[model samples]
Target: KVFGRCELAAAMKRHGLDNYRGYSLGNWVCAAKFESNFNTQATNRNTDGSTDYGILQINSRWWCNDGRTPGSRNLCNIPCSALLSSDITASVNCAKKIVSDGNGMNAWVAWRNRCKGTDVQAWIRGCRL
Candidate 1:
């Protein structure tokens, strides 16, 4: 199951992700909506045997290994399974590491496709971030 909009926003804020690496809070919210619908346990297998994990849909190819993906770099120094928890703390930590790489929010394809070059307040509308 997924978190409600405001719950996810509060979680992001508590983790200091309100506006990270120059991306707006709205951008993150919008990306999360599309990436995993705020579902902490979300995962998707790619054609390359890689998979995306967590609310941010972080890629296993460069992020974390679930012990099933061979050659995973595990850049976040965590197991992919760690991202699949309702607590969301580990996923937030990994997400911070990803955007700090100078790519900013560009690290998320969901951000690029859904939240970039657009006004994203709709993500936060009535949510009172």
Candidate 2:
């Protein structure tokens, strides 16, 4: 499912992504936009053999277990399938852990390339908080 901007914003806030670990709601929204374009089931297989899953693009290499990625830390201890759900609860939870691992929002390369040091307010503009 592809989320409307406000729906995604509300869901992110509801799941605690709003200002999570010093990153603002705008930051989260911007990352989501670029990571998965708001699609709940998005997946990207990296050249290194790891796959990024869901809207947040949580990685199987470290965050979740895909039952396929070798040496996967599965640090979040979640099945990668959970991240593909439209519910987003697992995705948001996994993302929290990923960011908490010392990288903050920069854990998502999409955020670093597209959202970092920019005016991200537009990502949430017109969305009623």
- What lDDT tens digits, residue by residue, belong to model 2 across residues 32-99? 99999999899999988999999998889888998988877798888899999979999988888889
Best by TM-score: 2
- Runs in model 2 deviating more than 4 A are none
Task: Give the clashing pairs for model 2.
Answer: none
Model 1 Cα lDDT, one tens digit per residue, 1-129: 589988798888889888777767788888889999889889999999999998989988888977887887999999899999888888889999999987888888878887898888777788765
Off by over 4 Å in 1: none
The C-alpha RMSD of each candidate to the native structure, in angstroms, is: 1.2, 0.7
lDDT of 1 at 114: 76
lDDT value for model 2: 0.91
Q: Residue 102 deviation, candidate 1, in Å?
A: 2.6
Q: In model 2, what lDDT does residue 3 have?
A: 97
